[PDB]
Design a protein around this ligand. Structure first.
Ligand SMILES: *Cc1c(COP(=O)(O)O)cnc(C)c1O
Ligand SMILES: *Cc1c(COP(=O)(O)O)cnc(C)c1O
Ligand SMILES: NCC1(CC(=O)O)CCCCC1
Ligand SMILES: NCC1(CC(=O)O)CCCCC1
Lengths: 363, 363
């Protein structure tokens, strides 16, 4: 059924593009690498995978990817250490999530490890594009779209899988943690139980653009997505949320919302849970967090740190939440931020190859 | 600002496709006409509109239309009367809805009447493609997509508006209306209040494919979309729902769910409400309909007709609903279907120019 890496076609570029410098401030995903991966699917099966020069897609105007959002994507980073070795961070989890997303949209199944090997081969070809400066990396963007020339809402009989790469600079200006303010208004819903918010589908993102603009108009940087009558904290923009506090039972704990359907199962999210569990210094749980619980904890001075997690930012500190038109200062930066700095340090040691780990996949 | 229809550039096809013609099977949305409308948008506003030959779209791999579902569409029909005159059905309402969809996804605004004249000119160029057989029409598909070559989840600085046309056959070949069976399972949710289900965005359709396949496996043609703990009937597949019954207060009425956020404001839906209100023979109301209300009405023999409404089907009868592993028989067909046939006949007479009406826009 699946495409094989052993069947890979190679077409090197004879028109190389200008590489960005470590000194020039880069915007997220605007400058791309020399090559891309492309695999075509039809009802008879997958075609042969190919590494070809970066080029535009040729799509039929009726392609189901453009009309009925038969599209999904992934996002992972490749890191270059001082010894020039490029490594991907827990890519197996991204491949797992990509296949789950594909099944939800009735898009073709593929072998997760064959796609991983094809992606490894692609990054190997564009190795010189992976930067080595502090906090920089190569963003990998796999995409699977429906491509049937039909206006009928049905299972695609044609599909296209492609992977593009882009060098990204340091998220924080310089190399120090800067906090974000969040708008928490229950009128905005990102996902729902029985919905598709737990899959990385394009459809979950388009509607967020206007809401993010509303957050900016109200003086906030990101949106704190609330869910249900009890105003459950779900996500911070397009990042998973973590709260480090002394809970109502008097125990020091790190909590993040559980995977009940409205939470996207983040790779960094899973890594922070795994890392903190291994330390065994405090309680680490997956449990629902409500605004009522957070309000009470803040007034009682029990909150230490609140942060967002994702591939783009790793660990993003939160200093303010605007809920029901009331400002809530989150003492994250006044508490170090001890845990965020510890997570940042240990993730960078694993990611840049200072410490050898099972989480890293060598390219 | 907006693009002007007076600036329209026409490039006719050098390679015309063979038309289906007399007695050939037409599958919905699989056969396309010779030309298409294309309008580009960037930083300096809209470009000049163009009618060019039917061809593939050239999109950058990072196009926000494919990653974050910055896409919307419309659907309306052009009808050809026996004397060869082509007319559009209430297109102003589709233009109004398209603009509302554009605003929700932070896509560029345009003038409703300028796009309408551009679509009229496109249908005029491909006028011979509009079939004249009973119940047949030309399906018009306007689309507006984000076309930003960036991986950032933001408002597009580039967009593309295009319109494609499809000659379609009669939904009920021979003229006789045929009913369908619906699967009603609360585990599947189409939209949520605070979401975007009330807009015609690509994102709302992709997730329905898997649900539709499950309905088919269970022996049902469409999905009856239920919402909330009270199991509110919202939509029949991707069509609005109508119930013709004797209400609990003993009064005969035609009811459809209100525009509370989870219902897409259909043009046919509004047309049926307008038509039924003009007659003044029964009560016409927009009120929430629950499964418990329908169950009580069925056993008491108060339900006369249940149907779906939309551009593709016009008025679609329902004879069975599979709910909680039990089959509920809906007496739609044995009741004529009196109201459905009256709606079908009046709409047919208006659409094919047999009866003059302000609802029709001449091409
Ligand atoms: C991508 C994403 C995340 C984080 O996932 P990572 O795998 O850790 O990058 C969290 N929430 C949403 C809504 C996301 O889209
Ligand atoms: C298109 C659509 C309708 C019907 O709208 P019409 O304008 O009458 O064609 C109803 N519900 C959904 C979900 C739709 O997508
Ligand atoms: N929040 C940004 C991401 C996830 C992340 O990497 O943190 C989601 C939207 C698309 C870009 C990536
Ligand atoms: N139900 C089919 C439509 C609406 C309609 O015309 O009934 C929505 C999906 C795309 C095709 C059109």
């Amino acid at each position: 059924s699946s495409f094989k890496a052993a069947d890979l076609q190679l077409e090197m570029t004879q028109k190389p593009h200008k590489k960005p410098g470590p000194g020039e401030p880069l915007v997220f995903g605007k400058t791309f690498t020399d090559h891309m991966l492309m695999v075509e699917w039809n009802d008879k099966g997958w075609g042969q995978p190919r590494i070809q020069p970066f080029q535009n897609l040729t799509l039929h105007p009726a392609s189901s990817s453009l009309h009925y959002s038969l599209q999904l994507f992934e996002g992972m980073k490749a890191f270059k250490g001082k010894d020039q070795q490029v490594r991907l961070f827990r890519p197996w989890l991204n491949m797992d999530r990509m296949l789950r997303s594909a099944m939800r949209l009735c898009l073709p199944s593929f072998d997760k490890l064959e796609l991983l090997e094809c992606i490894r081969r692609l990054i190997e070809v564009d190795k010189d594009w992976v930067p080595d400066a502090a906090g920089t990396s190569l963003y990998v963007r796999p995409v699977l779209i429906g491509n049937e020339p039909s206006l009928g809402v049905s299972q695609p009989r044609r599909a296209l899988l492609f992977v593009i790469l882009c060098p990204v600079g340091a998220y924080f200006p310089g190399g120090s943690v800067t906090p974000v303010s969040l708008l928490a208004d229950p009128a905005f819903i990102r996902a729902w139980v029985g919905g598709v918010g737990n899959y990385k589908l394009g459809g979950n993102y388009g509607p967020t653009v206007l809401v993010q603009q509303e957050a900016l108009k109200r003086g906030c940087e990101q949106v704190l997505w609330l869910y249900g009558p009890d105003h459950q904290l779900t996500e911070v923009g397009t990042m998973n949320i973590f709260v480090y506090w002394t809970h109502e039972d008097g125990v020091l704990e790190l909590v993040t919302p559980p995977l009940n359907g409205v939470i996207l199962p983040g790779v960094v999210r899973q890594s922070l849970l795994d890392m903190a569990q291994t330390w065994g210094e405090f309680r680490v749980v997956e449990r629902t967090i409500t605004m009522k619980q957070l309000l009470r904890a803040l007034e009682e001075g029990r909150v230490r740190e609140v942060f967002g997690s994702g591939t783009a930012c790793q660990v993003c500190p939160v200093h303010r939440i605007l809920y029901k038109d009331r400002n809530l200062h989150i003492p994250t930066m006044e508490n170090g931020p001890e845990l965020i700095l510890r997570f940042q340090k240990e993730l960078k040691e694993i990611q840049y190859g200072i410490r050898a780990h099972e989480w890293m996949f060598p390219v």
